[PDB]
Amino acid sequence: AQGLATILAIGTATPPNCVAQADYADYYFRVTKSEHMVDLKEKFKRICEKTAIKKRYLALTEDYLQENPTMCEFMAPSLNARQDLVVTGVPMLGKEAAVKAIDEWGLPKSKITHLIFCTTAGVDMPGADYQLVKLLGLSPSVKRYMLYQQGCAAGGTVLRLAKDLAENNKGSRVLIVCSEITAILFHGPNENHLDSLVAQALFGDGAAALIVGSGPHLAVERPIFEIVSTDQTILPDTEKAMKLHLREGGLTFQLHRDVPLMVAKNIENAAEKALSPLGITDWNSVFWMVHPGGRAILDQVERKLNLKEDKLRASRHVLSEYGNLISACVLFIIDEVRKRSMAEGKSTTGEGLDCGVLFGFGPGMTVETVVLRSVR
Amino acid sequence: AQGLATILAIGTATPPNCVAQADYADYYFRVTKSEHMVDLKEKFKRICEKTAIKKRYLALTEDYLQENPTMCEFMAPSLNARQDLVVTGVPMLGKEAAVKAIDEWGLPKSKITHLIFCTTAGVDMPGADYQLVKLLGLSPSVKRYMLYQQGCAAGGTVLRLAKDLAENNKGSRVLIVCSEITAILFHGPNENHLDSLVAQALFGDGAAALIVGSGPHLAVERPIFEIVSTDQTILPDTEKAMKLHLREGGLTFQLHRDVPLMVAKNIENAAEKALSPLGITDWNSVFWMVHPGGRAILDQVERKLNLKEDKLRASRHVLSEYGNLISACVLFIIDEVRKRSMAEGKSTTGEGLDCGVLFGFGPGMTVETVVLRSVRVT
After folding, report:
1. Are B85 and B15 in contact (CB under 8 A)?
2. Is A255 known to sit in a ligand binding site?
3. Nearest by CB to B150, which of A146, A236, A364?
4. CA–CA separation, A47 vs A197, rounded Å?
5. Which of B209, B252, B248 minimizes the C-alpha distance to B91?
6. Which residues bind acetoacetyl-CoA (chain A)?
């Protein structure tokens, strides 16, 4: 195609089940039948406090756990129950976000030439990509990219892949869907093996959908951000950061307690590598979209880049309103800065600034760094 | 980038443990202690016979089996055991193939800018892609595409994706690794579960690796094929063709008997969509690499496009020497074709022919159609 890959529409959706973080420990310990673990509950009460999460939407409900109680047992086999939920739920949630993007875009869905489906919740053959084309009625000849088991940096993964798709294929229009349902990693509290206990407080459900294309038809298409550049790098010596295994008992979860420090040690290098080519040295002259793996990661990034204390508001905002949405989370944040900037009357779609940097963090530890150019 | 994405090297690897198909029914029913199922044992021998497969390489060993006996159960929880095998084995097998590709390539590892890792066997976080760059010492900043649970058509998927990365990124060099270990799909024999049983006779293990790039440095790099065009379409009313679920008992397998006919029904359209823009109508005027989903799919494609009788010899060869290698299978066949061609002294890398078509067939049912342009041998 001709011109930079451009984001032209963003839609989001969540499961209807809302849970206030302020009530989560009571529910969670009630529901897993673990109220005798009071010290455990207190700790968990405290972790929920420090998440800086106000609420989450969860496809997993209390009825489901009743019917599939082994999901609450720590090492009881429960994958089949989890698959039953997410193999269906993930593409349905994704279709919901996609309808909104397609509607915002406004053009006929027959013009969608490429589908990128991304999730960290379950797998199946045929894929969630197949079900989405069916659900949506996309062309049977749409080219698909089925991204399974992707994790927390994959919101940047889908833009990096979309960029090359859109730019190498003249007139191509790419639909991106990241759809995450955290039922895959639900686990009861375990004194021993506390590992997945912070996961219970952290992750929320949702899907984000994007339309991306080169050479927008400016009469009927409305550019939101240009994708300037994408980088992916493995942080040295951080393999221990995060590990998640798909086992009989579900999606396992180990999170190293110094992950934020691993981000603090490497994040200026990623910033410099991305902005230096553009001639930018002042981090505060650009807008930031940071995957909120946790509050501490946001604070470290803010510290190490010496950000003004309002710089990560949009990121802190979707952590607050939704929790960690894994691969869909930075796409929610893109929507958030673009909507807030229109609401506030900014001169551009990127908080009135011309350039921005999105970060995704995942296993590896992997950093994805995408440079976005605002519009107007 | 430059002109067309171009395949510049290819390497293949397999587990060292080989099994003669002729002996597989005996091996199989004896390790699963399913000896009393003489009838079904007879049934399975007939299936092994008709596969047109002579041997398969398998990472799954009988002592791993007798060590993790639930894998043998005709359904019991065994995913942990299978994962334990494949989470390590898939990237190690893939590393083995990538070293060979990079060795053929001859350029520094450091020049590899993108990695596509593709498999159908197991998943892990960090992925097989991470493991691979660590095994090979690839650049930490290599751009990765981790293709999990992909299936029998993904040999075309990786080519289709490699094509756009290589063509949109000036001077980029893409490493493609497809590595498959059929242990996720191993199951003991059981009465009315026959598609699963047919799979115990069909799939073999292996990894293929390719170096893909645009604007080859013609001094040091040697083009093998150019990737001309790429299509993916789902075949109408064939959702039931194949279904595989990853569950506590491992990966399920369900295959409809009419899959060969479903391909037959749709294949000439695929060929026509791919070759008409090139002004080609003569199917015998081109080379064909057909994913040996089974011998019957090869027969059917051959019959439907009315190819001469040894048109599919290369696809038949690797099915015979390796079994169905899921996503890497057609990449083995690309190597077979170019290696047999250079050896017979063909004037091109594509059986002496100029253009060729490769077909991947997967769940959907999906067909991936990629057009390859051969290169002249001297």
Report:
1. no
2. yes
3. A146
4. 9
5. B209
6. 43, 46, 152, 255, 257, 293, 295-296
Please state the domain extents for chain B: 1-223, 224-376
Please give the Cα distance from A235 to A363 (Å, whole number): 10
Is residue A173 within a helix (H) or strand (E), and if so which, with residue range? strand A173-180
Torsion from C-alpha of B358, B361, B367, B368, nearest 10 degrees: -40
Nearest CA in chain B to A146: B147
Catalytic residue, from A152, A178, A329, A355: name it: A152
Is A46 annotated in a binding site? The answer is: yes
Is B231 in Cβ contact with A125 (below 8 Å)?
Answer: no
Kindly determine whether residue B125 and residue A77, on different chains, have CB atoms separated by under 8 Å. Answer: no
Nearest to A148 among B83, B148, B167 (CB): B148
Q: Output the six-digit token pair for A292.
A: 């909120």
In 3D space, the residue among A126, A373, A153 whose CA is nearest the CA of residue A263 turns out to be A153
In angstroms, rounded to a whole number, what is the distance separating the alpha carbons of residues A172 and A192?
A: 52
Task: Identify from A125, A228, A240 which residue to disrupt to test chain B contact, counting B C-beta atoms within 10 A and taking the largest count.
Answer: A125
Query: Does the domain made of A224-375 have the CATH classification 3.40.47.10?
Result: yes
Q: Which residue in the list B118, B152, B329, B355 is annotated as catalytic? A: B152
Breaks in chain B (C to N over 2.5 Å), named by the residue before each, are: none
Residues of A in contact with B83 (CB under 8 A): 245-247
Closest approach of B210 to chain A, Cα-based (Å):
19
Put simply, the answer to whether B149 touches A123 (Cβ < 8 Å) is: yes
Give the fold, CATH level 3, of B224-376.
Peroxisomal Thiolase; Chain A, domain 1 (3.40.47)
**Inter-chain CB pairs, A–B, below 8 Å:** 138
Q: Cα angle at A80 between A77 and A84, to 5 degrees?
A: 150
Q: Which residues contact A189 (CB under 8 A, 6 or more apart)?
A: A28, A29, A32, A34, A37, A40, A41, A44, A197, A200
Cβ neighbors of A356 (< 8 A, separation 6 or more) are A225, A286, A287, A288, A289, A337, A350, A371, A372, A373, A374
Residues of A in contact with B161 (CB under 8 A): 145
In contact, A197 and A29? CB cutoff 8 Å: no
Instruction: Answer yes or no: same fold for B1-223 and B224-376.
Output: yes
Method used to determine the 3D structure: X-ray
DSSP β-ladder status, B114-118 and B124-125 = unpaired
Is residue A44 within 8 A of residue A196, CB to CB? The reply is no
CATH topology of domain A1-223: Peroxisomal Thiolase; Chain A, domain 1 (3.40.47)
Instruction: Report d(CA B51, CA B41) in Å as an integer.
Output: 15
- The single residue listed with the structure tokens 């038949």 is B316
Please report the resolution in angstroms. 2.1
B126 to A366: CB separation less than 8 angstroms, yes or no: yes
Q: Is A152 a catalytic residue?
A: yes
Longest dimension (CA), chain B: 63
Residue with tokens 């949109």: B168
3-state class of B114 per DSSP? strand
Q: What is the C-alpha R_g of chain A?
A: 20
Say if residue A244 carries a ligand binding annotation: no
Enter the tokens of residue A225: 């951000």
The C-alpha of A165 sits at a distance from chain B's nearest C-alpha, in angstroms, of: 6
